[PDB]
């Protein structure tokens, strides 16, 4: 039985001011590097324990002992994502109901049905880059975010955000980004009741209304027309939970749609942006990936089956997720009093946070070369020990969108590698911006077209 | 679309008399040198196409298109190795079950637990060499086989073959060697049902009985005693497949044990033998390796972490596997009608053989200096083209023992290089003996002790 370390405190604010940064996950990573596999983090009225080792995280991932917790961040996101899958407690009726309805809509098999819509947006991206002038560059996370948001709009509810037709965001996205920003900013405030925050609060309510109005309108429009499409919305309007026999109500559908849009905008674009960063920094890898894309993607546009053959491209994506998991943390609570790791007593209800970037850097698992970008670590997926690699979370509360995200990312990276050579013309210095997700802020490249027609 | 070449035929026996040699792999390598990257090889009732270029092998390694085939050789080995992992089809229930149960036992993590038992045998080898008198030499494949067999016996099922205490093999080994010899010789026989071979069949049955008797007794004895070891047998007796929830039955366990014993006796001893051959033939490389061993192995016996630090020794082992892969071929079948390399049409079920020593000599990958021994080729795995280097096979049917073999070989080669200087006193001319594996027959060296304690 041992006492847990704790980072530096600030009197009555305890550890809370350590989150007063633009880069809180990176701060927590540095604390983990200093304090080790577990540390206590206290704010007024709450305690969290941050886990960094596979030894401890493997136990936390035992679903008979620990369940998903809504972290303070998720509780704030729940003000606009409601009881959608991501911001639901496992024990809420609407979690299991929506899970049972949507799970078939997100299978590997269901991706055959989304593939054409994914290709539509991917073609838009390739065409944009083909149309750049010689003196121009690509704003990577900006174009990746255009792609990933539009893809989930089209596949999700047959709505075109038309992000490649715009400098600034669609108004809906302006409101979503600002709502996510407020949710994340609230985490740092010592007195959130201060009237200095009244304008933030009003703007938050306005942004929620904008989001709800577009989504609610689309749902109502779809029901009135009776049209049947290949999108998640059709599946949600027709679906019945085999357990309750109930369909999702229109309010719940709206929350799911908002949830999917957030995942597309945030984590998926991050993955792509980091994958391109690691490629341009590791030209042997980029050559190997480009060779695969060239030999596999023999047709003007990729088929579903061809995307499945892009093994090395998938390895690149996994190794990007290892170093910079774009959903960097998830929270758990103890279902009963218990002891973690033979050493750390927990009371029922105690909160754990899994710090995924640190798990992915556990030298006990990965070796001493943890900071190196080496996709060949993933050559033989059989080799990865259990609960060592968790970029999509854990168990029944793992990411429902994992197949969608990897299919999209594999397809897009494949097409990018087929159609262009890339140059890190600025020798970009990695600068990671934190929202809900992580992204390489300011990352720019030049593309030289290989002149291969679509 | 092209006709593929074929070597010389013998009327109705087709190509089969080309295998009527005690060095068939070397014969097939010369055929590849003459005919190029693919050739058809026909025997009465079977056709297989031998591939030698990375260009075609990178396609053959696509698991969506090709699966592991039991070559005629593996079909004969299956008479004593059963539906163990090596001689199973991917679609047999027992393949996936055993695979799921045994993967954690063969992980890089599990090697921490075998390390002490590997050290035990490695110290026996070092001590034997320390005890030679001035005018004596080392019989290299003989001693390496003593070591590798004993290591898997001890780590596999807490059984000591005590090979360092014997000139003549343990009776179990006599039988296993003679069963492997029968299996391989049967390949060359045009009329296997000639009574000329009835003595061979009776001996084959007696040898299988000898092998089964020891292994079934060991399993029974372990179950009776109830004892709990750090060995594969313990994990196989207590393990349950996560998928089916079932344990392995005793028959299957016995096949797994027999399989592991074969791999230790054969391929692993070949690797160490060729590694020492290359080192004594390349004294600058030997020196660089010896310097690394001296810098890293600072304790009387190596720790697990010190072995992981022997990076150049690992590269030496990879460069030995490049030139003389001790499992020199594996077989695949086409899961569907398909076209290989845009040129060679295949029907569902058609067989391919990957001729690994020829793949590893592809000058388009390795460059002009392909016959040179240069460990530095392996400094960066990302610089190696996809599917260029396949000594442990491919995909989900790759060698489960790879981490074991490389840990053992790195350990032993490290300790050899720390404790002794080596002399190629006879200017040995490489003569490769073929069984299931390749070994340098008659390879002898003299060792001069550095007089460093254990
Ligand atoms: C690379 C991209 C993605 C990453 C890294 C990622 C990561 C995660 C993680 C870690 C969780 C677990 C959260 C927790 O335990 O609190 C999760 C849940 C979820 N993700 Fe993703 N995600 C990605 C893309 C997506 C996409 C594209 C969608 C939908 C279109 C999606 C929908 C969801 C949903 C609905 C859940 C909640 C599932 C449940 O608990 O029932 N995600 N995601
Ligand atoms: C103690 C050492 C070893 C053990 C216990 C071992 C075990 C095995 C097993 C059980 C398989 C079948 C895996 C499956 O299909 O699920 C296998 C395949 C293989 N092993 Fe090993 N092995 C060892 C050492 C080696 C070495 C040193 C080499 C080569 C230098 C090697 C080369 C291979 C190859 C090429 C295959 C694939 C066979 C094919 O596709 O038909 N093995 N090994």
From Swiss-Prot, chains A, B:
Domain of life: Bacteria
Amino acids binding (9Z)-hexadecenoate: 50
Site (Important for catalytic activity): 267
Mutagenesis / variant outcome for changing residue 263 to M: No effective fatty acid oxidation. No effect on electron transport from NADPH to FMN. Slightly lower high-spin conversion with arachidonate, palmitoleate, palmitate, myristate and laurate/dodecanoate
Alphabetically ordered keywords of this record: Cytoplasm, Electron transport, FAD, Flavoprotein, FMN, Heme, Iron, Metal-binding, Monooxygenase, Multifunctional enzyme, NADP, Oxidoreductase, Transport
Protein location: Cytoplasm
Outcome after substituting residue 85 to E: Ineffective covalent modification of the heme macrocycle. Extensive formation of Fe(II)CO complex in the substrate-free form
Principal place of residence: cytoplasm
Residue stretches spanning the membrane: none
UniProt keyword Transmembrane helix, yes or no: no
Descriptive protein name: Bifunctional cytochrome P450/NADPH--P450 reductase
């Amino acid at each position: 039985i041992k006492e847990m370390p704790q980072p530096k405190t600030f009197g009555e604010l305890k550890n809370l001011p350590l989150l007063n940064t633009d880069k809180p996950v990176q701060a927590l990573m540095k604390i983990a590097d200093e304090l080790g596999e577990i540390f206590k983090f206290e704010a007024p009225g709450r305690v969290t324990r941050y886990l960094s080792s596979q030894r401890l995280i493997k136990e936390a991932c035992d679903e008979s002992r620990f369940d998903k917790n809504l972290s303070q961040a998720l509780k704030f996101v729940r003000d606009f994502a409601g009881d959608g899958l991501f911001t639901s407690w496992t024990h809420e009726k609407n979690w299991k109901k929506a899970h049972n309805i949507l799970l078939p809509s997100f299978s590997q098999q269901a991706m055959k049905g989304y593939h054409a819509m994914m290709v539509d947006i991917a073609v838009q991206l390739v065409q944009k880059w083909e149309r750049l002038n010689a003196d121009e560059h690509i704003e990577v996370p900006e174009d990746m975010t255009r792609l990933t948001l539009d893809t989930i709009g089209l596949c999700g509810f047959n709505y075109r955000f038309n992000s490649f037709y715009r400098d600034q965001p669609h108004p809906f996205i302006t409101s979503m980004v600002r709502a996510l920003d407020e949710a994340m900013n609230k985490l740092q405030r010592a007195n959130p009741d201060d009237p200095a925050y009244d304008e933030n609060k009003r703007q938050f309510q306005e942004d929620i209304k904008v989001m709800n109005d577009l989504v609610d309108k689309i749902i109502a429009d779809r029901k009135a027309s009776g049209e049947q499409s290949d999108d998640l919305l059709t599946h949600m309007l027709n679906g019945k939970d085999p357990e309750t026999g109930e369909p999702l109500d229109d309010e719940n559908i709206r929350y799911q749609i908002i949830t999917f849009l957030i995942a597309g905008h945030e984590e998926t674009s991050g993955l792509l942006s980091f994958a391109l960063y690691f490629l341009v920094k590791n030209p042997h890898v980029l050559q190997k990936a480009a060779e695969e894309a060239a030999r596999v993607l023999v047709d003007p546009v990729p088929s579903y089956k061809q995307v499945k053959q892009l093994k090395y491209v998938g390895m690149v994506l996994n190794e990007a997720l290892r170093l910079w998991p774009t959903a960097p943390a998830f929270s758990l609570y103890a279902k009963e009093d218990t002891v973690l790791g033979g050493e750390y007593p927990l009371e029922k209800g105690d909160e754990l946070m899994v710090l995924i970037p640190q798990l992915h850097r556990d030298k006990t698992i990965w070796g001493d070369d943890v900071e190196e970008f080496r996709p060949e670590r993933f050559e033989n997926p059989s080799a990865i020990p259990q609960h060592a690699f968790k970029p999509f979370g854990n168990g029944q509360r793992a990411c429902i969108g994992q197949q969608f995200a990897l299919h999209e990312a594999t397809l897009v990276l494949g097409m990018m590698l087929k159609h262009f050579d890339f140059e890190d013309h600025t020798n970009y210095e990695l600068d990671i911006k934190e929202t809900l997700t992580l992204k390489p802020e300011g990352f720019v490249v030049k593309a030289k077209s290989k002149k291969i027609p679509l």
